[PDB]
Design a protein around this ligand. Sequence first.
Ligand SMILES: CNC(=O)CCNC(=O)[C@H](O)C(C)(C)COP(=O)(O)OP(=O)(O)OC[C@H]1O[C@@H](n2cnc3c(N)ncnc32)[C@H](O)[C@@H]1OP(=O)(O)O
Length: 446
Amino acid sequence: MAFKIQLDTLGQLPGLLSIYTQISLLYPVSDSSQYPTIVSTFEQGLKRFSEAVPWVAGQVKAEGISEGNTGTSFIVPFEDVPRVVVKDLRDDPSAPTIEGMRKAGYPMAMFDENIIAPRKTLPIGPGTGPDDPKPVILLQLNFIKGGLILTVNGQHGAMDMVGQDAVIRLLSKACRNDPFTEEEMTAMNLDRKTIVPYLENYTIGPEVDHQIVKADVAGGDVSASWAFFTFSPKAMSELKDAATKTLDASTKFVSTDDALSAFIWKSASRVRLERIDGSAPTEFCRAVDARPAMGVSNNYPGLLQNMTYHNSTIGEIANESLGATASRLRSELDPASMRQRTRGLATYLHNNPDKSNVSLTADADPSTSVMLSSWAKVGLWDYDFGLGLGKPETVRRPIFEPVESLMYFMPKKPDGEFCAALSLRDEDMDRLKADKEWTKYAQYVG
Ligand SMILES: CNC(=O)CCNC(=O)[C@H](O)C(C)(C)COP(=O)(O)OP(=O)(O)OC[C@H]1O[C@@H](n2cnc3c(N)ncnc32)[C@H](O)[C@@H]1OP(=O)(O)O
């Protein structure tokens, strides 16, 4: 069995290219007697999964690279099964414990990628060189006192987080020995290089606004930190209520996700007034799953994502109502618009052997921007992997190097709790944490 699956055209984008997406699921473990079965069940699952869908055990490999041709990458064979690393941290005094996690409310700092992940997010350190293999997925099982942390790394050219969730979802089935449906098997096997229909005779249009690096425009792929903040279900509904009451006339409704995204942009912009003038431009870059606009199954495991861009000034965003800000976000989510824009980006990339200038954050200034990726809608809270431990107690992204203005929403807890990971420069983070309008809704976790 061999395969040579060309990445999604969108997955040829440089910045998605060299990165691994990480996610950790924490389960309590009653007795250390349970670990060997945990591991063998997980092993057997990975083998079953690889037998059904061989490419999940592959690697991403570029070819045709030269001066001004940045190449084309393909998923190709690597090893028999995806690699899992098993790490026993029960007796490591620098490791988290289930009780430490519970007491601190599952802070990002307790999910240190160097301790609990099989490879770093960024191409930093040993084994991240261009000739080093890039496995499509990598797993780590970490035994901690009273628990288990399962970490999954997805090669970002091969998958966005919606695609990674679909892969993980089927891994959970395989661990249970539950059969895959025909639609799942079809979705996992759709050809990627044709999944976004190209535009005819396309050169450059507004579709790729904010996505091509230009020498006179700041942006592209100071002391700062990461922290989780939690938003209770009631905080979430109160933010949505506040937004709904203050919508633009053009805007019939906004979502829970819109209202939190808007509240973050407003709160960042507000504290930033303490260090820059209100006239400073500010861009919100919001990650959007493009599967629905493209008519693609939610089970498609690839990379089919874009961003929406929202430009204003720090003072306008801080001072306008929450519904005014949420309306800006929702205004860019028309499916026909998402579809045309995504087709345009894919067509531009297709037409250009040198993709080095294309970036989803090409004109985002880290000082004043927000680059937010919501994972709120993914299904990770529901997977038990046949381990007999119940559902995840939490689902958190590992901490890595601060990236100013980069932000995530975690998969939404079933009760509706949101967890936002923010990376900000220290003076912003410090003011935010002390800011009364922020802490009215946001509980700092760290
Ligand atoms: C890298 N990250 C990614 O891949 C990003 C993943 N996320 C996405 O792409 C998401 O679609 C998103 C861009 C983040 C938008 O997230 P949303 O949760 O707003 O989803 P969306 O489907 O646009 O809208 C759903 C909301 O709209 C609401 N809605 C839909 N129709 C109506 C209507 N007729 N009247 C009132 N509300 C409506 C709906 O009730 C949802 O609200 P809520 O209950 O969740 O508050």
